[PDB]
Amino acid sequence: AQNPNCNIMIFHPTKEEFNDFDKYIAYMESQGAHRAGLAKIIPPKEWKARETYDNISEILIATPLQQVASGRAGVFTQYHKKKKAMTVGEYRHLANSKKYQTPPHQNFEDLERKYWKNRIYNSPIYGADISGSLFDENTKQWNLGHLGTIQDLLEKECGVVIEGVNTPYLYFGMWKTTFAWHTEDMDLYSINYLHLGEPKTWYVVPPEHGQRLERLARELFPGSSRGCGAFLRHKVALISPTVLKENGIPFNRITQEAGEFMVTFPYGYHAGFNHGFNCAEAINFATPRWIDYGKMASQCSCGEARVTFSMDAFVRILQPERYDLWKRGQD
Ligand SMILES: O=C(O)CNC(=O)C(=O)O
Ligand SMILES: [Mg+2]
Ligand code: NI
Ligand SMILES: [Zn+2]
């Protein structure tokens, strides 16, 4: 078995190898990459996502989210308070202000220490989940707006034709902006490109050990667990590496820098934080190997997780027993 310790693997495809996206994902999996739940892909040196970022300040962040924490430094939840609209130029100036900017630090490790010590005492503002793309239309390789759709994968593998579309999302971050522990909708893959700015640190649990994280989460967030049988789908709970280590949960960490892709694999729980002002683009995708994960994915039916139009069909075809109850939650 390849990569039996479930380490995060880093790939350096050539420009030739960067032509066929599906084929490269399958290659990475042949090397055991998926066992970690997360992989890094450094694009060939000849590739670029677009020519410059010089003209992005006029993108609107219609609903910036203030991420307010509750709990203790290593075990907390976050709620998202909606703020007034602002442009990316306005958001970048806010990220760079004295109130919100990255503190002085020695290296990524010192910054990580500061994040886990001090995150709860601040409420950074995250411009998350903005439909759109920063890839130039002429970028033909690993253009996250030109990928094969999940609906088309489901049709190729299973013969069934369904409604729905699959488009990318932009994320504008600042120091301490946080993504809570989660797997993707329907335990899909994700791919995330860091277009510009400061790094993003990731934590990940191997898919084969995801239920150990779930059991710890039920213990640490016991009222949330009684409220919903899949409350991690709410995307609000944080658990630090120190707490994970104290509880014997297998995990890994890695820092993504501008110009790099990350892939999350089906049922790979992940969480993380931004080091400073940045912009990422991410989208869900599927392969043939995902289908069985999609059939087994948990679902939030308490009604809190409230997700996309296209998830309806996935549930309806892959999980027809749950259909009914899951749609009572979503309506
Ligand atoms: O970048 C972020 O805030 C969150 N991204 C992801 O969870 C992802 O790409 O799967
Ligand atoms: Mg603009
Ligand atoms: Ni994710
Ligand atoms: Zn729920």
Side-chain angles (χ1 to χ4, degrees), residues 1-47 49-50 52-81 83-214 216-244 246-305 307-327 329-330:
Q2 293 268 223
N3 190 24
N5 285 354
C6 301
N7 294 315
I8 298 166
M9 300 179 70
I10 302 164
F11 293 90
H12 287 88
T14 61
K15 60 185 195 312
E16 297 72 26
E17 288 173 332
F18 218 54
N19 285 307
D20 183 337
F21 182 85
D22 292 348
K23 180 183 180 170
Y24 202 78
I25 302 296
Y27 170 72
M28 293 160 57
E29 297 188 354
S30 74
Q31 305 302 298
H34 58 292
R35 296 193 63 176
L38 183 66
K40 176 178 293 193
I41 310 93
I42 296 169
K45 69 190 177 297
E46 302 85 1
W47 178 92
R50 63 178 307 102
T52 78
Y53 292 85
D54 279 343
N55 297 106
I56 68 168
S57 308
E58 323 301 310
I59 293 169
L60 193 70
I61 305 170
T63 314
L65 302 176
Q66 180 178 49
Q67 302 188 295
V68 180
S70 298
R72 62 181 177 102
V75 181
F76 63 90
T77 58
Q78 61 187 7
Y79 87 91
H80 290 166
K81 184 172 177 156
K83 308 296 277 187
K84 288 186 169 181
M86 80 181 76
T87 65
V88 162
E90 289 164 338
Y91 180 87
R92 180 176 62 222
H93 189 257
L94 184 71
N96 295 337
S97 69
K98 293 186 183 172
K99 176 171 180 66
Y100 290 106
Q101 67 183 222
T102 317
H105 60 281
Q106 296 294 342
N107 50 42
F108 292 171
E109 179 167 359
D110 184 36
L111 197 67
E112 179 184 42
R113 180 188 68 68
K114 288 175 190 287
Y115 173 84
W116 293 105
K117 186 184 159 48
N118 299 318
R119 161 67 185 94
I120 66 168
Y121 303 110
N122 298 84
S123 305
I125 291 170
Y126 208 173
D129 287 315
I130 294 165
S131 293
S133 186
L134 290 168
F135 285 88
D136 186 314
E137 74 176 4
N138 297 316
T139 300
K140 298 318 176 176
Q141 297 172 325
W142 289 56
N143 181 324
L144 301 188
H146 296 174
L147 301 180
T149 70
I150 300 158
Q151 299 77 16
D152 282 344
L153 180 286
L154 189 153
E155 184 181 329
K156 294 186 291 193
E157 293 299 296
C158 304
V160 62
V161 186
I162 52 171
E163 72 287 359
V165 296
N166 179 205
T167 57
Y169 296 91
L170 301 178
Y171 300 83
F172 291 95
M174 66 169 64
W175 170 235
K176 283 173 176 169
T177 53
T178 300
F179 52 109
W181 282 104
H182 70 283
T183 63
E184 303 303 307
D185 291 342
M186 217 74 188
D187 297 343
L188 282 157
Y189 296 70
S190 64
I191 180 165
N192 181 302
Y193 181 67
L194 192 53
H195 281 280
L196 61 93
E198 303 311 309
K200 187 185 296 282
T201 292
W202 300 66
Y203 305 91
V204 58
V205 175
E208 74 201 63
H209 302 302
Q211 295 90 352
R212 295 187 185 216
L213 182 70
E214 295 172 349
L216 179 59
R218 296 189 301 272
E219 292 165 1
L220 296 177
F221 304 95
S224 291
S225 179
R226 285 185 291 269
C228 178
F231 74 95
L232 296 175
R233 297 281 168 210
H234 309 167
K235 306 192 312 190
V236 302
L238 279 299
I239 306 164
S240 73
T242 293
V243 174
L244 291 179
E246 284 169 346
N247 291 276
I249 307 307
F251 76 94
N252 282 297
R253 75 193 82 190
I254 195 167
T255 299
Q256 176 191 22
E257 299 185 76
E260 305 178 337
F261 291 91
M262 306 297 295
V263 166
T264 83
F265 293 88
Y267 198 63
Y269 276 103
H270 54 282
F273 65 90
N274 295 302
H275 291 208
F277 173 71
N278 67 16
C279 172
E281 178 170 342
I283 197 177
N284 296 120
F285 72 92
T287 70
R289 196 177 65 79
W290 167 67
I291 296 275
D292 284 347
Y293 291 85
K295 296 177 181 164
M296 289 174 323
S298 66
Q299 307 295 352
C300 169
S301 316
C302 81
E304 281 294 307
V307 311
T308 188
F309 181 94
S310 310
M311 230 199 92
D312 193 275
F314 304 155
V315 179
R316 192 171 73 247
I317 299 308
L318 297 182
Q319 307 185 312
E321 186 254 354
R322 288 192 174 156
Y323 189 72
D324 294 18
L325 185 74
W326 168 88
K327 200 168 41 63
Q330 242 20 36

